[PDB]
Amino acid sequence: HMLRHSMDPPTFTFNFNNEPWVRGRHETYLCYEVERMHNDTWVLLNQRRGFLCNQAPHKHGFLEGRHAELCFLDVIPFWKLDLDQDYRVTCFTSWSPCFSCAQEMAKFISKNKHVSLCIFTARIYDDQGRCQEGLRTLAEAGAKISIMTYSEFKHCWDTFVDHQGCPFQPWDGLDEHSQDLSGRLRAILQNQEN
Ligand SMILES: [Zn+2]
């Protein structure tokens, strides 16, 4: 006789949500929420939080490491609406996009703003810089990125978690973290000179 579906009892006991960052060393992991628009208006499917890890073989025609970004980019053509309609996508991944994955996406976007991505990410850590190309490209080209800070954090739960008032709490680190993502997102776009 199971208790509640509110994920927490097993993940809590098993370990300590040590769940490292995306693309750890076993398999991807991320949440994504999208909605389909019907004509000049919006529609909300019957789904809260959902996603899928690892991809399957398409037999003679496999795709590359599609990240959350391309993930929805791939769902929209899944419902196969019409044109007069629209798509308001929302991605939830403590991790932001990538130099390339961002491009792929940005295109689909820049090429057709008809899409609206609202990415809510927590923090990213890389040692590139010049590759940021896509980053500022899919971000400006039409993807709305947001740095999920303390407030947006407890909120991130309040978004998909079966408790608009989950018991999660902020740690005296969000500072360094936020700074990193923010200072960056800012930078990459604000092309912070030398
Ligand atoms: Zn990627």
Structure, described:
Zn(2+) 2 binds at residues 67, 98, 101. It comes from Homo sapiens (Human). The protein has 194 residues and is an alpha/beta fold. The chain has one domain. The protein is built from six helices and five strands; from the N terminus they run αββαβαβαβαα. Helix 4 (133-141) links the parallel strand 4 and strand 5.
Q: What is this structure, in a nutshell?
A:
GO terms for molecular function: cytidine deaminase activity; dCTP deaminase activity; identical protein binding; RNA binding; zinc ion binding. Residues 24-138 form the CMP/dCMP-type deaminase domain. This protein has one domain (1-194).
Major sheet attributes: 5 strands, mixed
* Strand-pairing-aware structural class: alpha/beta
- End-to-end separation: 61 Å
The overall number of domains is 1
What ions, cofactors and ligands are bound? Answer: zinc ion
SSE ordering = HEEHEHEHEHH
Number of helices: 6
Radius of gyration: 18 Å
How is the largest sheet built, in terms of strand order?
2-1-3-4-5
The best one-word shape is globular
Beta fraction of the residues? Answer: 5-15%
- The total beta strand count reads 5
The amount of helix comes to 25-40%
